[PDB]
Design a protein around this ligand. Structure first.
Ligand SMILES: CCNC(=O)[C@H]1O[C@@H](n2cnc3c(N)ncnc32)[C@H](O)[C@@H]1O
Length: 217
């Protein structure tokens, strides 16, 4: 259940965190970009697999703020991940070139992070803990969590609650509490969803005060 990150991943997490220090809100752009890719994959599968979308008939990205819990949630209904995939895909990693590319560019990698497929780690810039709950058609719902010093994966004792997809839950750092603010979230989600071809909603409030999904693109 408990794993260590690959040496290269530790170096990469540090690089990413060190360079994006001043431009932190791109973590949201990167997570949204990953959710898009997840949806594209499931959509490509729905073409050859008639049952692919069985677990969840929708193809969306929903974001919600839990200010009391101090949590940020980014859930997609994409391909999702198996237990093995959570361990390999997040715990392991043009890797060597990217390393030299990043260092020589820090001595704006904001674009070089999205280029390569490692924007997920940028979450650690605003979170102390990152939790990945995911449901894949060929496995049971699992949870991956890490504070960057190690990571573990277990079976979700809650069972299949997603159907299919992934929820990225970020335990926000104290100085990152502005991201629990709906409007701070909407400005960032409306800015980073304008290129995404799947609908992105933010659990917002309207006034008396009812809550519901508000589309962002
Ligand atoms: C190096 C960081 N790891 C990733 O972003 C990879 O992990 C998996 N991943 C990350 N976020 C998601 C997601 N929301 N849905 C599906 N796979 C994901 C993909 O294979 C990514 O390429």
């Amino acid at each position: 259940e408990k794993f260590a990150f690959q040496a290269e991943v530790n170096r990469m997490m540090k690089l990413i965190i060190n360079s994006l220090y001043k431009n932190k809100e791109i973590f949201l752009r990167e997570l949204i970009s990953n959710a898009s890719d997840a949806l594209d994959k499931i959509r490509l599968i729905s073409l050859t697999d008639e049952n692919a979308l069985a677990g969840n008939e929708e193809l969306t990205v929903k974001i919600k703020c839990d200010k009391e819990k101090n949590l940020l949630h980014v859930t997609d209904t994409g391909v999702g991940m198996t237990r093995e995939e959570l361990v390999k895909n997040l715990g392991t990693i043009g890797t060597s070139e990217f390393l030299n590319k990043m260092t020589e560019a820090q001595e704006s990698t904001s674009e070089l992070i999205g280029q390569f497929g490692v924007g997920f780690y940028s979450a650690f810039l605003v979170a102390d803990k990152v939790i990945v709950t995911s449901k894949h058609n060929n496995d049971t719902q699992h949870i991956w969590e890490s504070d960057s010093n190690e990571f573990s994966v277990i079976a979700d004792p809650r069972g299949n609650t997603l159907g299919r997809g992934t929820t990225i839950t970020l335990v926000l750092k104290e100085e990152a509490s502005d991201y629990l603010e709906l409007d701070t979230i909407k400005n960032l989600v409306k800015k980073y969803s304008q290129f995404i071809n799947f609908p992105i909603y933010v659990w917002s409030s309207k006034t008396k005060t009812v809550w519901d999904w508000e589309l962002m693109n």
